[PDB]
Design a protein around this ligand. Structure first.
Ligand SMILES: [Cd+2]
Ligand SMILES: [Cd+2]
Ligand SMILES: [Cd+2]
Ligand SMILES: [Cd+2]
Ligand SMILES: [Cd+2]
Ligand SMILES: [Cd+2]
Length: 67
């Protein structure tokens, strides 16, 4: 049942639709919302070292090397 929803570190912007984090993002790790989450690590392997391969499994809540 888990996997649907937002995290505690989500913004009031991410909790709006559409995602208002386009100009106001501060979401933490508990956010798999690709609307505000972006990543540079590729599917062949993690590049930053947080063990992530894209926003689909990016633990990083921005402000990281792969950001
Ligand atoms: Cd969020
Ligand atoms: Cd979002
Ligand atoms: Cd956000
Ligand atoms: Cd990474
Ligand atoms: Cd990442
Ligand atoms: Cd990272």
């Amino acid at each position: 049942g888990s996997g649907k929803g937002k995290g505690e570190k989500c913004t009031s912007a991410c909790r709006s639709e559409p995602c208002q984090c386009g100009s106001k993002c501060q979401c933490g790790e508990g956010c798999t919302c690709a609307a505000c989450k972006t990543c540079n690590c590729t599917s062949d392997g993690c590049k930053c070292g947080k063990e992530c391969t894209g926003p689909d499994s990016c633990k990083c809540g921005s402000s990281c090397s792969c950001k």
